């Protein structure tokens, strides 16, 4: 690295999105004309949530990991009242919008995203990095439409223990992370299972009206397949969404699954 920037090196463009600790803007590196994403955090909005030692992880991890399906993080710098992150810019938005845009995905688009996803995960896992936060809203799209994993905020070394207060929805967490038990790389395989189901049905398999009824549905692994989901998909999803971490497949089996060869 060896490059410390300032808000003055970038011409902020249109607001890409968000509203949490801050926003994400399209931005232009004045010197080289380079285009990227600049995510701003108000600093104050962070401290009062103690992410200090977690946003620290988001920045450090996502910085060293380099893979075509991982969103690259270039560097960062703090304002007088803020903290900006210099991220790779993903031209086609989040996968979350792609969904509200098509409702469901076909078996080739689902099989392909699941592929790129498994490869990308197999990499982080090659390095004991577990994401634990695979939402279709933490999945971007590169200029050629390839899936790109982002927001390694909840990322962590593994095997590990979850203190973590686990704020938002449970739609994507496995019985172990929700019943606050220990866990490993296998948590990212249950998530891959959910995504697959969501990419094909339009909603997650455990979706509920309350955090509490989802919690049940998850721990008891209670999910059903609408009539259109093909067998080959039910199979893979049923293989991934098994309660016992050790019984879920490896990524090879996922990248080799018969039905997975209905992609690109
Ligand atoms: O549709 C659009 O206009 C749209 C949405 C997304 C992108 N890409 C992009 N690139 C880099 C970072 C990034 N962060 C986010 C942007 C909005 C919401 C959440 C995030 C995030 O941090 O995951 N989003 C481009 C256009």
Curated annotation (Swiss-Prot):
Gene Ontology BP term (one): positive regulation of mitotic cell cycle
In-chain residues carrying the UniProt-annotated modification Phosphothreonine: 164-165
Subcellular localization, as worded in the UniProt entry: Cytoplasm, Cytoskeleton, Microtubule organizing center, Centrosome; Cytoplasm, Cytoskeleton, Spindle pole; Cytoplasm, Cytoskeleton, Microtubule organizing center, Centrosome, Centriole; Cell projection, Neuron projection
Record cross-link Glycyl lysine isopeptide (Lys-Gly) (interchain with G-Cter in SUMO2), residues: 135
Binding site for ATP: 20, 39, 88-90, 137-138, 151
Substrates-to-products reaction catalysed: L-seryl-[protein] + ATP = O-phospho-L-seryl-[protein] + ADP + H(+); L-threonyl-[protein] + ATP = O-phospho-L-threonyl-[protein] + ADP + H(+)
A molecular-function term among this protein's GO annotations: protein kinase binding
PTM annotation (Phosphoserine): residues: 219
Effect annotated for changing residue 211 to A: Reduces binding to MYCN
Reported impact of residue 223 to A: Decreases the interaction with phosphatase type 1 isoforms
Active-site residues annotated for this sequence: 133
Resulting phenotype, residue 165 to D: Mimics phosphorylation state and increases kinase activity
Subunit structure: Part of a complex composed of NEDD9, AURKA and CTTN; within the complex NEDD9 acts as a scaffold protein and is required for complex formation. Identified in a complex with AUNIP and NIN. Interacts with FBXL7. Interacts with CPEB1, JTB, TACC1, TPX2, PPP2CA, as well as with the protein phosphatase type 1 (PP1) isoforms PPP1CA, PPP1CB and PPP1CC. Also interacts with its substrates ARHGEF2, BORA, KIF2A, PARD3, and p53/TP53. Interaction with BORA promotes phosphorylation of PLK1. Interacts with CIMAP3. Interacts with GADD45A, competing with its oligomerization.
Name of this chain's protein: Aurora kinase A
């Amino acid at each position: 690295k060896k490059r410390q920037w300032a808000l003055e090196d970038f011409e902020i463009g249109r607001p890409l999105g968000k509203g949490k600790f801050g926003n994400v803007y399209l931005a232009r590196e004045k010197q080289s004309k380079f285009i990227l994403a600049l995510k701003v955090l108000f600093k104050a909005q962070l401290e009062k949530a103690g992410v200090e030692h977690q946003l620290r992880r988001e920045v450090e991890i996502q910085s060293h990991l380099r893979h075509p399906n991982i969103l690259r993080l270039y560097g960062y710098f703090h304002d007088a009242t803020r903290v900006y992150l210099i991220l790779e810019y993903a031209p086609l938005g989040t996968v979350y919008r792609e969904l509200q845009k098509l409702s469901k995905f076909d078996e080739q688009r689902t099989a392909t995203y699941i592929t790129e996803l498994a490869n990308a995960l197999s990499y982080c896992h090659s390095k004991r990095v577990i994401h634990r936060d695979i939402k279709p809203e933490n999945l971007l799209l590169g200029s050629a439409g390839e899936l790109k994993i982002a927001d390694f905020g909840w990322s962590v070394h593994a095997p590990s223990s979850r203190r973590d207060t686990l704020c938002g929805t449970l739609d994507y967490l496995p019985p172990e992370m929700i019943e606050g038990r220990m866990h490993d790389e296998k948590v990212d395989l249950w998530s891959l299972g959910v995504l697959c189901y969501e990419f094909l049905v339009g909603k997650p398999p455990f979706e509920a009206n309350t955090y509490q009824e989802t919690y049940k549905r998850i721990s008891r692994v209670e999910f059903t397949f609408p009539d259109f989901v093909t067998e080959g998909a039910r199979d893979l999803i049923s293989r991934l969404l098994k309660h016992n971490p050790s019984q879920r497949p490896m990524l090879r089996e996922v990248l080799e699954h018969p039905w997975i060869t209905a992609n690109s």
